Design a protein around this ligand. Structure first.
Ligand SMILES: [Zn+2]
Ligand SMILES: [Zn+2]
Length: 359
């Protein structure tokens, strides 16, 4: 897994804040997932901060909002500089100990992974590098990103630090964002139009990224989504007005440590079985990655798992096909995997990445 330092600009730390990253001249956070925040509130880094007053964390406006909602990250409050998307910004890296100054230009590109998720394009004295963080980009998407181009053609990119979550031909294709939403929208409509007592439980992991499912169910069916907490979205109206803490809705994305046991007893995670003494009829819809081999005999994005239970195709990460199209297109000198998944090896991932790089 990425240990925070790119060879080309070793004095900045991205998405890793422990060990050798405690010496960084500047910090970057691609997105507000725990996987990418290791060390970010170690006492020793809070200490580092108080002594080195010229060290800052850079991220999207949305990532800043989501990080500064959580009380354990409020010590960052005055040391976070948000940079607007698609806005090449010059950063002054200064070494406190030696007085050495380096100048670097950073561009935040949308990563399509969760609210505030960005890729970081770095331009300075040691070549152009792209850190993707976690990303999901449809085929052709890189070719339509203006700031990956100079004079109509792809920039000379020395190195790409790439999300390789599904970097194996096993995961050849994954249904698109729009097919996944279409399949969930239709199942939810088919259920909740039957009677006011027919309700959906969206069984989502406790992590940013499902907001656009809630947003699109809410818009299309005129029904707000029940959630445990929405205070992270208090300064984010485009999301917030699709959510509610009011349990009087037919669409729930609430959570509870015993939600599975609750479901067995026709109880929603927020604790209701009934409305006006009438029992609810609950179905569970569990977003779950589904994939299809090269032979394109794709199946339904909805899969029924029991009397009242469904899985729905959903992915936070690019398919093998999307990774190859993205890297193929950029044709960097070097590609480095941000992760080696449990079922593959560094050797097999590099054997996939090497042919898509220059020469
Ligand atoms: Zn992530
Ligand atoms: Zn609920």
């Amino acid at each position: 897994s990425f240990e925070g330092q790119m060879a080309e600009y070793p004095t900045i730390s991205i998405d890793r804040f422990d060990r050798e990253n405690l010496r960084a001249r500047a910090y970057f956070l691609s997105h507000c997932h725990k996987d990418h925040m290791k060390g970010l509130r170690a006492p020793t880094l809070k200490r580092r901060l108080e002594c080195s007053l010229k060290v800052y964390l850079y991220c999207s406006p949305v990532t800043k909002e989501l990080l500064l909602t959580s009380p354990k990250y409020r010590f960052w409050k005055k040391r976070i500089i948000s940079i607007e998307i698609e806005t090449p910004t010059q950063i002054s890296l200064v070494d406190e100990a030696s007085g050495e100054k380096e100048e670097i230009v950073v561009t935040l590109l949308p990563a399509g992974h969760c609210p505030g998720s960005v890729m970081f394009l770095f331009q300075g004295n040691n070549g152009t590098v792209l850190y993707t963080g976690d990303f999901r980009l449809a085929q052709g998407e890189a070719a339509r990103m203006e700031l990956l181009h100079s004079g109509g053609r792809v920039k000379d990119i020395q190195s790409v630090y790439l999300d390789t979550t599904f970097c194996d031909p096993r995961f050849y294709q994954i249904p698109s964002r729009e097919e996944c939403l279409s399949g969930v929208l239709e199942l939810v409509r088919s259920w909740i139009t039957r009677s006011p007592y027919h309700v959906v439980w969206l069984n989502c992991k406790a992590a940013y990224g499902y907001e656009y499912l809630f947003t699109n169910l809410s818009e299309e069916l005129g029904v707000q989504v029940h959630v445990n907490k929405l205070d992270m979205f208090r300064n984010m109206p485009e999301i917030l007005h699709h959510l509610t803490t009011d349990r009087n809705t037919q669409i729930h994305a609430c959570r509870h440590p015993k939600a599975e046991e609750y479901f067995q007893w026709s109880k929603l995670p927020c604790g209701i079985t009934s409305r006006n003494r009438i029992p609810l009829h609950i179905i569970s819809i569990k977003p779950s990655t589904m994939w299809f081999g090269e032979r394109s005999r794709k199946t339904n994005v909805i899969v029924r798992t029991g009397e009242s239970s469904y899985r729905a195709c959903f992915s936070f990460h690019s398919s093998y096909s999307e990774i190859k199209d993205f890297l193929s297109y950029l044709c960097p000198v070097n590609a480095y995997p941000n992760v080696i998944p449990v079922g593959t090896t560094m050797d097999k991932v590099v054997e996939i990445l090497k042919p898509l790089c220059r020469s």
